[PDB]
Write a protein that binds this ligand. Sequence first.
Ligand code: AGS
Ligand code: MG
Length: 252
Amino acid sequence: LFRSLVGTSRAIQQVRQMMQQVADTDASVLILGESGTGKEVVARNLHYHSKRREGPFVPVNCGAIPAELLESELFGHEKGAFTGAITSRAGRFELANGGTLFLDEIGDMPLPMQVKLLRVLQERTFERVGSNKTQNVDVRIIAATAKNLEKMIEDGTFREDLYYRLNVFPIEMAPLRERVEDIALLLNELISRMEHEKRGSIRFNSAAIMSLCRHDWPGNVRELANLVERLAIMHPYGVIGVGELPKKFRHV
Ligand SMILES: Nc1ncnc2c1ncn2[C@@H]1O[C@H](COP(=O)(O)OP(=O)(O)OP(O)(O)=S)[C@@H](O)[C@H]1O
Ligand SMILES: [Mg+2]
């Protein structure tokens, strides 16, 4: 199920080298890049080539989780912690023990939780909400952001100390529009997925590929994948020329 990073560009070949180097280590990894540039693919790949490969891979979607329950969600809770605690759950961190914790959009993590994350990176311990008992954790952190963390540091919306703790081995994902030589290969890979998964089939003629190579791709590879899916419904087992592209994708 593991995905590979497809592409021949300078930038993507560089990311593969960096991945191979850091994967087997226990260093924290910060992956930086726009939405849809492969940051989670990079993260999953790092994990399954790590010492922790058979351990759990636990995502944390920093922006989504209701702030009311953020600390509970991340660190678990004991009972009578808060209104309607009742049951019992452990948090994302405890669940990730012996594995990898993946902090998707770390730029959205609120300051109070940044302090607590810094404790885990530094003391490798934590306490469930309500309990002042201390638990050891054994996790490797991989974080990703589309934000400018150094701007945030300046704005005081991101902690400098967490930053230097997390940014031990940064990996930059170039946006699609800077890797346009990879677009054909990405197309083949995406079409191959869709075929292997009984979800239709298409192929692009050279003109249509030229047109796509001139596109800005604000949604990067996720936007590319979206377009392949739509075209396979609009023109099943068809060949996509310039004229079958939606007008926004035409650049001639
Ligand atoms: N180089 C690549 N080779 C193959 N598939 C890729 C590549 N880059 C991205 N993908 C795929 O395109 C999609 C992009 O997914 P992600 O890796 O999650 O993007 P992202 O950078 O994590 O953006 P967010 O934070 O989830 S909005 C996934 O379906 C990936 O499998
Ligand atoms: Mg993701």
